[PDB]
Amino acid sequence: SLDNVEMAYARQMYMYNEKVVSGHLQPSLVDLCTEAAERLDDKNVSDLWVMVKQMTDVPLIPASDTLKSRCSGQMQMAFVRQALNYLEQSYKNYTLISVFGTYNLVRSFLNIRLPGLQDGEIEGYPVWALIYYCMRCGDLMAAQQVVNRAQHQLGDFKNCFQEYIHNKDRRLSPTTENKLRLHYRRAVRASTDPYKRAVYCIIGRCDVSDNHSEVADKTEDYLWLKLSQVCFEDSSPQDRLTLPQFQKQLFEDYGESHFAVNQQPYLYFQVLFLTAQFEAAIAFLFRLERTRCHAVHVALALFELKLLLKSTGQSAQLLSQEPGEPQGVRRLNFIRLLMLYTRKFEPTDPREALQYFYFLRNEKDNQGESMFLRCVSELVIESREFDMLLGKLDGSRKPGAIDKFTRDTKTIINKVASVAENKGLFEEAAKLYDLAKNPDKVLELTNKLLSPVVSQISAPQSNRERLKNMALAIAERYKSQGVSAEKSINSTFYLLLDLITFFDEYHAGHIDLSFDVIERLKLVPLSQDSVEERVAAFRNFSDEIRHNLSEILLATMNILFTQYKRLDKDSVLRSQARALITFAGMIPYRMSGDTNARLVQMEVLMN
Amino acid sequence: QVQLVESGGGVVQTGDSLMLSCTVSGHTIDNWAMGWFRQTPRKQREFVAAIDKRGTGAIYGNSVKGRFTVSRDNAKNMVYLRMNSLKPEDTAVYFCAVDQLNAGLGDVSYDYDYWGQGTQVTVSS
Amino acid sequence: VQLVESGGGLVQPGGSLRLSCVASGFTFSRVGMGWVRQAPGKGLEWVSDINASGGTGYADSVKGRFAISRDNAKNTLYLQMNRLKPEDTAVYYCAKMMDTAMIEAGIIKPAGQGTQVTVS
Numbered sequence: 001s002l003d004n005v006e007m008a009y010a011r012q013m014y015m016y017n018e019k020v021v022s023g024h025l026q027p028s029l030v031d032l033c034t035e036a037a038e039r040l041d042d043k044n045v046s047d048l049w050v051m052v053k054q055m056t057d058v059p060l061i062p063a064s065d066t067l068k069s070r071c072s073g074q075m076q077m078a079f080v081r082q083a084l085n086y087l088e089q090s091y092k093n094y095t096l097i098s099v100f101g102t103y104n105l106v107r108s109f110l111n112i113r114l115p116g117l118q119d120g121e122i123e124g125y126p127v128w129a130l131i132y133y134c135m136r137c138g139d140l141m142a143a144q145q146v147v148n149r150a151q152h153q154l155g156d157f158k159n160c161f162q163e164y165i166h167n168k169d170r171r172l173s174p175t176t177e178n179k180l181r182l183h184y185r186r187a188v189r190a191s192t193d194p195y196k197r198a199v200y201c202i203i204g205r206c207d208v209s210d211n212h213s214e215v216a217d218k219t220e221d222y223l224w225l226k227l228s229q230v231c232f233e234d235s236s237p238q239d240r241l242t243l244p245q246f247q248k249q250l251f252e253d254y255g256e257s258h259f260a261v262n263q264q265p266y267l268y269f270q271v272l273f274l275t276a277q278f279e280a281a282i283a284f285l286f287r288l289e290r291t292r293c294h295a296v297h298v299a300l301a302l303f304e305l306k307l308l309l310k311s312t313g314q315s316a317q318l319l320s321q322e323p324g325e326p327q328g329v330r331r332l333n334f335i336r337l338l339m340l341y342t343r344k345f346e347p348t349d350p351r352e353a354l355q356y357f358y359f360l361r362n363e364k365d366n367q368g369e370s371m372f373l374r375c376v377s378e379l380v381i382e383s384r385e386f387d388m389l390l391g392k393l394d395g396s397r398k399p400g401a402i403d404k405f406t407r408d409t410k411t412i413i414n415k416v417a418s419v420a421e422n423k424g425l426f427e428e429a430a431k432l433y434d435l436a437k438n439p440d441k442v443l444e445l446t447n448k449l450l451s452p453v454v455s456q457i458s459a460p461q462s463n464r465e466r467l468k469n470m471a472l473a474i475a476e477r478y479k480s481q482g483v484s485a486e487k488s489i490n491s492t493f494y495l496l497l498d499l500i501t502f503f504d505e506y507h508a509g510h511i512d513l514s515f516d517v518i519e520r521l522k523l524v525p526l527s528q529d530s531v532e533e534r535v536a537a538f539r540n541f542s543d544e545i546r547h548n549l550s551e552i553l554l555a556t557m558n559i560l561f562t563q564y565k566r567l568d569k570d571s572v573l574r575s576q577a578r579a580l581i582t583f584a585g586m587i588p589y590r591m592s593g594d595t596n597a598r599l600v601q602m603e604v605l606m607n
Numbered sequence: 608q609v610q611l612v613e614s615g616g617g618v619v620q621t622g623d624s625l626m627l628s629c630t631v632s633g634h635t636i637d638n639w640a641m642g643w644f645r646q647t648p649r650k651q652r653e654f655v656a657a658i659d660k661r662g663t664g665a666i667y668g669n670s671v672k673g674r675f676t677v678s679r680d681n682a683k684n685m686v687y688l689r690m691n692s693l694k695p696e697d698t699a700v701y702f703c704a705v706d707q708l709n710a711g712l713g714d715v716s717y718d719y720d721y722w723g724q725g726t727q728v729t730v731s732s
Numbered sequence: 733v734q735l736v737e738s739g740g741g742l743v744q745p746g747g748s749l750r751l752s753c754v755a756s757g758f759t760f761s762r763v764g765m766g767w768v769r770q771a772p773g774k775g776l777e778w779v780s781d782i783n784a785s786g787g788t789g790y791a792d793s794v795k796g797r798f799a800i801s802r803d804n805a806k807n808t809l810y811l812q813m814n815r816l817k818p819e820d821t822a823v824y825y826c827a828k829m830m831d832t833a834m835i836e837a838g839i840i841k842p843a844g845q846g847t848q849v850t851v852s
């Protein structure tokens with residue numbers, strides 16, 4: 001069933017739906033989920049959601065199409081900016097706490113880290129390490145303080161870092177970056193002070209093959225390095241590190257088989273997510289048993305902010321790639337995702353399952369219908385529809401789950417009833433149609449399943465009692481509430497019920513009772529000058545009347561013959577009999593050979 | 608329909624080593640991943656092992672870490688689970704299912720679509 | 733279905749018995765049944781009828797010598813034969829009152845296994 005975390009997320013989904021269906025302007029998913037890390041005690045989920053929130057606060061699609069946005073350059077600039085800022089504030093908190101101001105914070109961390117070195121020290125601390133680590137926190141004004149103090153062994157770095165903090169894309173003049181590269185490989189690369197090389201690297205986008213394992217030991221640090229290093233400008237084509245190349249690099253090294261095997265999923269996920277690719281992150285994180293719900297709800301959050309490149313066609317993969325994108329990212333088969341998440345607790349606690357189901361509403365299907373409907377129509381039938389799912393009629397509809405977030409339920413009811421109808425679960429669909437206030441459909445459906453049993457004898461362990469009570473309750477509700485159905489179907493229904501009672505009395509053994517019943521039906525000959533109209537009466541009789549006329553006529557003939565043998569009146573009786581013969585003598589409708597055989601046999605025998 | 612045969616079970620004794628096999632019936636397993644689960648009366652289903660589509664690396668369950676081995680032979684279209692140092696609880700029917708989702712190495716039952724029928728095993732201590 | 737009738741045998745002039753029949757295969761609470769007989773030397777002749785809840789019916793020669801009894805609680809029917817006459821000598825049938833017609837005039841044959849009802 002559910003876990004406390006699962007039911008917690010669930011309740012929150014309830015709340016978001018009660019928001020969107022009420023017409024309130026509310027905080028979107030990401031906000032609720034963010035706060036839903038301190039309602040229950042945790043440590044990591046909080047961090048994941050922090051990352052998600054910070055990474056989704058972007059200018060949302062400065063275009064008209066999601067693909068355009070998620071492949072435009074400026075969009076990726078926004079992504080990398082948000083990402084960098086998150087990493088940097090993260091590391092800032094990490095040090096600021098683990099050390100137990102900023103300018104001396106980094107200083108103390110250096111002192112509690114490490115006690116050839118280029119360009120000496122200031123205040124007794126090596127300048128290059130100071131510069132690097134104080135940039136690492138995303139604070140340049142401290143680096144500005146340093147380069148104001150430390151200014152006597154540089155002066156190219158001075159204006160370098162100046163025009164670094166002058167363009168908001170952190171890009172220098174082209175020739176500036178080029179002379180930085182030229183000085184780097186010519187006097188800087190071959191040095192024994194790595195830190196200086198790392199600083200010149202990030203500040204000048206140099207040597208995109210270096211990883212600096214010594215100073216950026218941590219995977220998070222590695223992300224910092226490469227993202228601080230990536231470039232969208234085209235300066236040389238040999239140190240141009242393209243963000244798509246980095247996404248491919250990470251997808252290579254991290255994930256696609258390495259995710260589940262390394263038993264540190266949260267961190268891997270933050271990696272795969274900070275790199276401007278959401279789909280392939282959730283798709284992995286969704287697989288591990290520990291972090292199913294967190295992945296699924298990150299996906300829902302993303303979808304609600306319309307930040308998702310979902311699968312347009314229908315396939316059998318969760319994460320898919322359609323060989324048309326420039327690079328894009330693997331598309332996420334959103335529908336299959338919701339399905340393969342709900343199916344765990346769908347057939348046990350469907351109340352909450354229906355809640356997730358709602359989100360697929362505007363996502364069409366193969367047939368041309370909302371997938372949401374073709375989803376409910378399975379849950380509600382294979383989990384034995386209750387009133388809590390739809391409701392119970394009397395003359396008044398009981399509110400159900402589907403009511404609480406959708407108006408005009410009659411739509412959903414008609415749909416699911418038709419679906420269960422095609423499925424061959426007919427009786428249940430009759431009940432549903434009745435819960436929908438649609439008389440013609442209820443009655444036409446009951447017609448079929450009523451037709452064949454109307455002459456089957458009492459037969460203990462049958463359906464007759466059940467369907468009889470069903471149709472009787474139908475009659476009560478409809479004739480009492482003044483509900484009237486289509487004439488040619490209402491008529492056939494009431495004829496079928498009167499015939500039910502007639503045959504009950506017949507089987508029971510009341511001759512004259514059933515006889516006046518069959519008289520007052522005008523289905524069979526009563527006078528030799530009316531049989532010509534009897535022949536005209538049908539050609540409007542549906543298959544129902546056909547599928548029993550045989551036994552109707554047979555039973556009637558039985559009544560007549562019993563009266564005759566048990567009996568002047570026999571003239572009238574046998575005249576009615578030969579009229580019946582003439583009737584059967586010209587029926588195009590259903591019969592059997594033995595039907596007319598017994599008919600004419602009893603006829604000539606009573607003669 | 609692409610069915611499966613999940614065979615190699617039987618009754619064995621404690622501390623022995625059992626080789627459970629599975630053979631695909633009607634497809635080429637080079638895109639899919641493979642998974643060996645077990646059905647006990649303890650639960651309805653649990654996880655044992657799952658191997659990716661490259662035949663290189665696999666995830667082992669919550670308790671069985673460091674006692675089993677799994678492999679897939681694309682050239683033989685077979686799935687192999689060889690065990691060591693069994694436990695009384697392992698009297699169970701082991702299933703071998705297929706992963707198409709084309710991502711990761713799932714460890715939850717529902718993620719897989721097709722199945723064989725199972726191979727029953729019974730350890731007698 | 734099945735209609736077994738028993739409780740017969742040669743009985744003395746003016747004897748008495750209670751013919752039993754077991755109703756199984758149809759709800760014997762909403763089906764009217766009946767008793768017929770065919771003799772070794774004579775044809776089929778209706779003797780008894782009764783509805784689910786309605787009244788009864790008997791031939792002119794069998795009134796006061798037989799008696800209906802539909803033990804519906806047990807889905808069993810009986811016919812209490814008394815002070816008999818040497819013309820009921822026949823095999824009996826606990827049949828359905830509504831099929832009595834098709835059986836009576838040699839049209840169709842009974843579905844009951846019968847019982848030996850012979851009187852001196």
